Amino acid sequence: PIELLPETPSQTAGPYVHIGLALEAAGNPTRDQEIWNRLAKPDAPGEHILLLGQVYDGNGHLVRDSFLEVWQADANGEYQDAYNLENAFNSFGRTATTFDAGEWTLHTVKPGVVNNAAGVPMAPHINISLFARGINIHLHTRLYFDDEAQANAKCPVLNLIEQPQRRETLIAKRCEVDGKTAYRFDIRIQGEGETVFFDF
Amino acid sequence: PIELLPETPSQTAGPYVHIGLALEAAGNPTRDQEIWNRLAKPDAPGEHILLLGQVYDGNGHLVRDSFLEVWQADANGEYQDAYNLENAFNSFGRTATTFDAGEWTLHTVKPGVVNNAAGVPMAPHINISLFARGINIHLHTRLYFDDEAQANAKCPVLNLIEQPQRRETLIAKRCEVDGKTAYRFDIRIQGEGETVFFDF
Amino acid sequence: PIELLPETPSQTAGPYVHIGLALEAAGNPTRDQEIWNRLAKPDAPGEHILLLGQVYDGNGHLVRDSFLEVWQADANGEYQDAYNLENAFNSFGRTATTFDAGEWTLHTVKPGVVNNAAGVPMAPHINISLFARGINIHLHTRLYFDDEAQANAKCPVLNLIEQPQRRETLIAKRCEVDGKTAYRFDIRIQGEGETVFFDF
Amino acid sequence: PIELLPETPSQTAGPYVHIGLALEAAGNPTRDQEIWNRLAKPDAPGEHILLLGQVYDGNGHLVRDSFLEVWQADANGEYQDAYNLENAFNSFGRTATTFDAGEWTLHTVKPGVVNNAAGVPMAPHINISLFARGINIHLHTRLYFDDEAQANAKCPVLNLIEQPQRRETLIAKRCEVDGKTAYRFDIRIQGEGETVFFDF
Amino acid sequence: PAQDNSRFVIRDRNWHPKALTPDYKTSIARSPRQALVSIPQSISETTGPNFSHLGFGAHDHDLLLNFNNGGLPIGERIIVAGRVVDQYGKPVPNTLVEMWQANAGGRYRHKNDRYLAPLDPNFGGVGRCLTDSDGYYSFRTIKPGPHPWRNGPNDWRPAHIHFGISGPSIATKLITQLYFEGDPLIPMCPIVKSIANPEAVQQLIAKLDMNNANPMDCLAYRFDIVLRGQRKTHFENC
Amino acid sequence: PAQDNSRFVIRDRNWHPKALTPDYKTSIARSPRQALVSIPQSISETTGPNFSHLGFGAHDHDLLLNFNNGGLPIGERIIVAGRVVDQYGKPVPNTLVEMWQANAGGRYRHKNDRYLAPLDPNFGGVGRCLTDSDGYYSFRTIKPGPHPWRNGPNDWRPAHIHFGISGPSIATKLITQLYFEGDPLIPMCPIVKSIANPEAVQQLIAKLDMNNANPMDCLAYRFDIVLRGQRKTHFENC
Amino acid sequence: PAQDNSRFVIRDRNWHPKALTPDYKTSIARSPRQALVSIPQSISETTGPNFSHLGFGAHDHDLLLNFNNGGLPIGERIIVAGRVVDQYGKPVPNTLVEMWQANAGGRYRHKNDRYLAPLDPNFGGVGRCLTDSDGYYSFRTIKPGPHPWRNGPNDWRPAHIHFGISGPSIATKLITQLYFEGDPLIPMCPIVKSIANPEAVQQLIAKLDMNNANPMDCLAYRFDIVLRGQRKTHFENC
Ligand SMILES: [Cl-]
Ligand SMILES: [Cl-]
Ligand SMILES: [Cl-]
Ligand SMILES: [Fe+3]
Ligand SMILES: [Fe+3]
Ligand SMILES: [Fe+3]
């Protein structure tokens, strides 16, 4: 058969990933421009939301060295690839869990609906890639919203998860943090309540 | 050493096993004669019973595409191997769970006692072979009866299971379905309460 | 793919074939029973006919060392495989061309119609296998009759010959020899008027 | 020596070539635009002519499944390579014999004179490529015109054919079809009067 | 009735696929985590149904005719034939061989197959027969097409026919899959690769069998099946 | 109009099949017995039609949709794609690629094919396209079935698609056949074996191309085509 | 805004390291036990950030100058350079390449690294750049020392540089590690050996590149990166 050049194989990001990819989180000096966890400036259109979460291993213990990358549509359901710190909104961001701060946070807007390749609407979601010591190739997941139950029930991606119980692992829980709308999205890498991870 | 011709290797029956082996359930027309789940005509000697069960994966979820083959002695402890739809009793039958509720049923009689090769009586049992998508080589088990405690306790096959707690997984529970004598035999393929499976 | 034992390869019969297979034609002493050119005794049912012919090479020159075997139905269209010199009719015979007698002869009856494997009638025919010095594997042909034009035109075997002109090579010519019905069937191995040869 | 990538090897077009390249003839519906046998619209400059011919195998039998491609200069000696069904003249066309039509036809104009690479005029000609069942790589030839005898005698391509008798095989015969100017160009693939075929 | 009068050679469960073969994703949660418990052979295991008295329809072995809704199925006409023997080379006569498969486009006639390739109105996909007195079986069918499936993101089954064979006892009963000589999908399939030993994989590949073809009609493939060796009992209880 | 400004590398007629290959029976009477006459390249041979202005229908390259009589054709959905280059490796853009084939059962939609395998009412078997600006072409189709034929008494074509490619001149024009990776019929076919060199035969075998497949939809095969090398003229007439 | 116009060749997850590789002890509790769920590519997966307008400082790619506290860092001065391409061989221009590493003694400038080898006051160990219009990147740095770590009782990372590459989409984003030609620690490392295929491990080994060295100044290593092949969509939703 036709065999292309093989892709470069993945390796773990390791425990010191934050020195390369999360300088402030590493408590190291930052450069003038960093890619970080504020996707939306106050004047971005849409519903401003705080996202937060903790990451657990197979023994139920906190993962305090995780590095997360996120990719989401703007409130209008459009992906904005022109990354610029001057933008009111960027579709891409980074966050981390650390020894000092075991709970990651993101400051964003709720994403609008995006159609799949067949034209079928997907429920509002944030794409997440999870990296850490012990993780040899990053884990892909999606964060959906518990106040989008009708859309979630019809999402062609959620519906590829055979068991309804596992779909529940991708639904972030609405709350309030200091008076502002927030969602908690915890990830369980292994075992009871294991978060669904995707291949694509 | 002496090496015989290798046996043809097993493969999974796959999710469409019903096309070939459970035609009704595939949604398909049947042929004039089918091998199915009614082992006994109403005139067959012995105690007429219903067997039913559900099959669970390692996540506690129903296996809704299982296919089961059974082999049991008649009420007089004789294996009736000359398969014939006109027989009062067939020692062989087939059943399947299907989507819906995931429950299989068999209509039979309670088997009589048969001796092992050393002449020691075995407790009444039904031999079961379980096939499905995800199962690469079929799983062998036995269904014993909870109202045969004395015989069960002395069975030379059950006594080969090292742990009494595991012996309990093979004991079907007497119950009533539409007022008629039945025994429920659930199978747990993996994990908590995992059903004992045999090699022979 | 599946490869069976290979067939033993053919070789030419060579110039002295008659010493083994045509003893009288070789002018050598015969045994008590020989397989020869009289398929029908006078008592055989059917139309008694004399067949005769000459064999030519690619230069138009007579082949004076040919050996022919023939296989045909009786007048009722049945093949008679039980070869016996006591029979009024045998379906099999042998003839030859020699230095002294360059024209072979056969004494037989006109064969009845035989159906092909699909049940379609074949025109009356004699199957011929031709052997000689220079012929590495024998040549198969059929002798049909010029007074069976209607049947010939419908024969499913003749109709597998793409060109009508080549079909004519298989049609023997009715004549009279010493007052009796005869057909001449000349064979041209190569070149102008080349006789159709079959593979089966 | 310097060895380039090998050319993809030829294979016969086979007997069903018309399915792909002569749709009308296969018995099939045509697409909106087809490449076919009318090179010239009525307004095209030059002398409008019909070309026709039959193709013979080595046994003198018609090749009924021939497919022919032609390439010729327009009346002004110009090769029109921008193929378009709207053109007054296309230098390229296709035709075929078929069973229904064992004769091929082309509607064109007489080509003007073209010089060879050394600047020497070639006699008026049509370049032909012949494809069919039994032909493993197409045969190249040229059709010249019998009323161009003076030019033909000086053609540097015709003069590369060593024997004058073989040159005659490339000279089409002027005739009239339904009262209109035509030239017949029969091709004999093999044997007596074998048509000259070219390599270049 | 049946009697205990034979023993069957113990299976090599490293020749067979293991239960847990995670590249075949559904095996992860459907594989036991505890060891199988070995038990000695008794009459319960060394006997099984014989199907000599099962009534077969005229076309049960012929998938070109057994789902006839006005025409022939579309696709590559093939005979699939072979012999069932045990590990000692002894033929297994009058044994039940069942098969099922997708149509020429890789679509199954099952309510749960929603692959976009069309059903064939003249193809059902199920066959059965008994081996003859010398151990041979034969079916006539259409060569199935490869079937895409929701395992990895671009996984395709090679062309394959599912087989079940009863044999002389419940100890010999086997379900397997036939694949076809040369199919470039075979080395890529995680179901094929559930079998760790490459030599075992080769035992599932049917060979083109021109000797058994009907000219101008259908091709043929040969697929031989080997069930567990059967022997008489000896020196037991003494 | 066209001009003479290039030369084409001379063909290797021992790499191509010879005219007389008697195992392919119809070649015996359809092969010239006289030698080909070599002629130098002129404008007549070094030019040819370009098809940029030919009007193509929307589905001309898509055999799943171009004979639509109420449904999809039955059979293995496949993309057949590749690149046309010359012997120097230069892409051949905007060139005409035509193809034709049998349906999934080896039956041709031609009046002269009376093989008993049925026609598919939604399959025609004809495609065309132009290569793009980088030399690539693409068709969508059904994988054809093997085709029995009246050569030897049990001869079957391997699965194959007929191809015609125009290229830059009448000197480059080529008709050939594509075969499929692994097909056990390939080594048996007297038409394949008209090519004497085994390495040339390999050049006609399309490879399974999983990288180009549409998951849950269609597989893909890759078939690259090499036309005669084209060079500028040099040092002529001096 | 970004558009869905491309597809990416599916990953070979037996070429990459698997999740559960127990000799790398931390992977035991940080590997999912359920199968990944395959999903089709949509605009969510086939797009990603373009960093063309991220503002880079003058020395972001030069670790000899980007942590300047009064001197040059101690250790082997090297250029690390290479090309980012996709599996079709197409360069990946204007893509973000980030890297981090220990100093010459195997010590990281992170609070959690308490290895006894000293920090270098003029080394920070972090770099970033974009590939140029032809897919090439380059850093200047110190060759890192092996790093002991609490896996097995005497485990040492080979000298290595961590790499992150964005590529055209979130589907191509990759984190990996570079190793150095000839390092005898490579075959011994359980993180290297998380990769099952020895040929894949070889793809992570940077080669000494004397051609790219500055004489009397610095040596050079070459490390090329291959991201998932990108192709146009074809024959979707039809
Ligand atoms: Cl035998
Ligand atoms: Cl290129
Ligand atoms: Cl380049
Ligand atoms: Fe299947
Ligand atoms: Fe063909
Ligand atoms: Fe490190």
Q: Which residues of G touch E153 (CB under 8 A)?
A: 10, 38-40
- Helix or strand run (H / E) with residue C144: strand C139-145
Give strand pairing partners of E18: none
Tell me if there are at least 3 CB pairs under 8 Å linking chains E and G: yes
DSSP state letter for E30: S
Q: How many CB atoms lie within 10 A of CB C75?
A: 19
Can you tell me which residue has the tokens 């000689």? C132
Inter-chain CB proximity G54 and A99 less than 8 Å: no
> What sign for the dihedral angle of Cα E118, E119, E122, E125?
positive
In angstroms, rounded to a whole number, what is the distance separating the alpha carbons of residues A124 and A150?
11
For residue D15, report the distance from its CA to the centre of ligand 5, in Å.
8
Inter-chain CB proximity G235 and F62 less than 8 Å: yes
In angstroms, rounded to a whole number, what is the distance separating the alpha carbons of residues E137 and E81?
6
DSSP state letter for D23: H
In single-letter form, the type of residue at position E212 comes to: N
Inter-chain CB proximity G13 and E151 less than 8 Å: no
Inter-chain CB proximity G16 and A9 less than 8 Å: yes
Inter-chain CB proximity F184 and C200 less than 8 Å: no
Q: How far is F37 from chain D (nearest CA, A)?
A: 5
Inter-chain CB proximity B71 and E203 less than 8 Å: no
For residue D67, report the distance from its CA to the centre of ligand 5, in Å.
15
Inter-chain CB proximity E152 and A199 less than 8 Å: yes
Q: Which residues of F touch D33 (CB under 8 A)?
A: 54-56
DSSP state letter for F83: E
CATH number at C84 reads 2.60.130.10
Which residues are CB-neighbours of C98 under 8 A, at least 6 positions away? C18, C25, C26, C64, C65
CA E53 to chain centre: 22
> What sign for the dihedral angle of Cα G51, G52, G53, G58?
positive
3-state DSSP helix/strand/coil % of chain F, to nearest 5: 10, 30, 60
Specify the 3-state DSSP secondary structure of A163. coil
For residues E119 and E103, is the Cβ–Cβ distance under 8 A? Answer: yes
For residue B12, report the distance from its CA to the centre of ligand 4, in Å.
9
Between the alpha carbon of residue E62 and those of residues A136, C187, D36, E165, the distances in Å are 51, 46, 46, 17
In angstroms, rounded to a whole number, what is the distance separating the alpha carbons of residues C146 and C16?
34
Nearest to D117 among F24, F177, F236 (CB): F236
For residue E177, report the distance from its CA to the centre of ligand 4, in Å.
8
For residues E120 and E73, is the Cβ–Cβ distance under 8 A? Answer: yes
Per residue, the 3-state secondary structure of F94-145, as one string, reads: CCEEEEECCCCCCCCCCCCCCCCCCCCCCCCCEEEEECCCCCEEEEEEECCC
In angstroms, rounded to a whole number, what is the distance separating the alpha carbons of residues E112 and A130?
34
Q: Is C167 annotated as a binding residue?
A: no
CB contact, 8 Å: E150 with chain A?
A: yes
Q: Subunits touching C (CB < 8 Å, at least 3 pairs)?
A: D, E, F
- Cβ pairs bridging D and F (under 8 Å): 270
In angstroms, rounded to a whole number, what is the distance separating the alpha carbons of residues F144 and F77?
10
Q: Which of residues 112-131 of F touch A (CB under 8 A)?
A: none
Q: Which two tokens stand for residue D183?
A: 């030239």
F3 → chain D, closest CA residue: D79
For A57-87, give one letter per residue: b (16+ CB within 10 A) or e. Answer: bbeeeebbbbbbbbbbbbbebbbbbebeeeb
Q: Which two tokens stand for residue A53?
A: 């979460």
Q: Which two tokens stand for residue G6?
A: 């491309």
For residues B139 and B197, is the Cβ–Cβ distance under 8 A? Answer: yes
- Among F107, F70, D4, residue whose Cα is nearest residue E74: F107
* Phi/psi of residue F77, nearest 5 degrees: -65, 125
Q: Which two tokens stand for residue C94?
A: 């042998």
F205 → chain D, closest CA residue: D8
Q: In this structure, are strands D92-96 and D103-109 parallel, antiparallel, or unpaired?
A: unpaired
- Among A104, A32, A26, residue whose Cα is nearest residue G100: A26
Q: Which technique was the structure solved with, according to the deposited record? A: X-ray
CA E164 to chain centre: 5
Tell me if there are at least 3 CB pairs under 8 Å linking chains E and D: no
For residue G89, report the distance from its CA to the centre of ligand 3, in Å.
9
Q: Which of residues 122-181 of A touch B (CB under 8 A)?
A: 163, 165
CB contact, 8 Å: E209 with chain C?
A: yes
For residues F195 and C12, is the Cβ–Cβ distance under 8 A? Answer: no
CB contact, 8 Å: B99 with chain A?
A: no
For residue E118, report the distance from its CA to the centre of ligand 4, in Å.
16
- Helix or strand run (H / E) with residue F198: helix F198-202
Q: Subunits touching D (CB < 8 Å, at least 3 pairs)?
A: C, F
Q: In this structure, are strands A67-72 and A126-131 parallel, antiparallel, or unpaired?
A: antiparallel
Which residues are CB-neighbours of F168 under 8 A, at least 6 positions away? F6, F48, F92, F95, F227, F230
Which residues are CB-neighbours of F149 under 8 A, at least 6 positions away? F155, F156, F157
Q: Residue G135: nearest ligand to its CA?
A: 3
For residues D24 and D156, is the Cβ–Cβ distance under 8 A? Answer: no
Specify the 3-state DSSP secondary structure of B102. coil
Gapped junctions in chain B, after residues (C–N > 2.5 Å): none
What's the start-to-end Cα distance of chain F, in Å?
A: 26
For residues D7 and F10, is the Cβ–Cβ distance under 8 A? Answer: no
* Phi/psi of residue F192, nearest 5 degrees: -55, -45
In angstroms, rounded to a whole number, what is the distance separating the alpha carbons of residues F103 and G73?
71
- Specify whether the backbone of B32 is left (phi greater than 0), alpha (psi in -120 to 50) or beta: alpha
Dihedral angle over CA of F189, F191, F193, F198, nearest 10: -100
CA E179 to chain centre: 10
Nearest to A197 among G26, G36, G51 (CB): G36
Which residues are CB-neighbours of G50 under 8 A, at least 6 positions away? A81, A82, A83, G94
Which domain covers residue B122, as residue numbers? Answer: 1-200
Stated resolution in angstroms:
1.6
For residue E131, report the distance from its CA to the centre of ligand 4, in Å.
23
CB contact, 8 Å: F182 with chain C?
A: no
Q: Which two tokens stand for residue G222?
A: 């070459």
Which residues are CB-neighbours of E235 under 8 A, at least 6 positions away? none
Q: Which two tokens stand for residue B125?
A: 């049992």
- Best residue in D56, D59, D65, D99 for a mutation probing chain C (most C CBs within 10 Å): D59
Please enumerate residues of A whose Cβ is less than 8 A from a Cβ of F: 1-2, 4
Per residue, the 3-state secondary structure of F13-54, as one string, reads: CCCCCCCCCCCCHHHCCCCCCCCCEECCCCHHHHCCCECCCC
- Cβ pairs bridging A and F (under 8 Å): 13
- Among A123, A148, A127, A147, residue whose Cα is nearest residue A138: A127
In angstroms, rounded to a whole number, what is the distance separating the alpha carbons of residues E74 and A130?
49
Which residues have CB less than 5 Å away from ligand 5 (the ion)? Answer: D 14
Inter-chain CB proximity F153 and C160 less than 8 Å: no
Specify the 3-state DSSP secondary structure of G233. coil
For residue F2, report the distance from its CA to the centre of ligand 2, in Å.
27
In angstroms, rounded to a whole number, what is the distance separating the alpha carbons of residues A66 and A53?
11
Alpha helix stretches (DSSP H) within chain C: 17-21, 149-153, 164-167
DSSP state letter for C196: P
CB contact, 8 Å: E76 with chain C?
A: no
* Phi/psi of residue B127, nearest 5 degrees: -85, 130
- Cβ pairs bridging E and G (under 8 Å): 19
For residues F129 and F137, is the Cβ–Cβ distance under 8 A? Answer: yes
Q: How far is F7 from chain D (nearest CA, A)?
A: 10
- Helix or strand run (H / E) with residue F201: helix F198-202
For chain G, domain boundaries:
1-238
Our count of domains for chain B comes to 1
| Domain at G1-238, CATH class | mainly beta
Q: Residue G175: nearest ligand to its CA?
A: 6
Q: Subunits touching G (CB < 8 Å, at least 3 pairs)?
A: A, E, F
Q: Which residues of G touch A200 (CB under 8 A)?
A: 38-41, 45, 171
In single-letter form, the type of residue at position C49 comes to: I
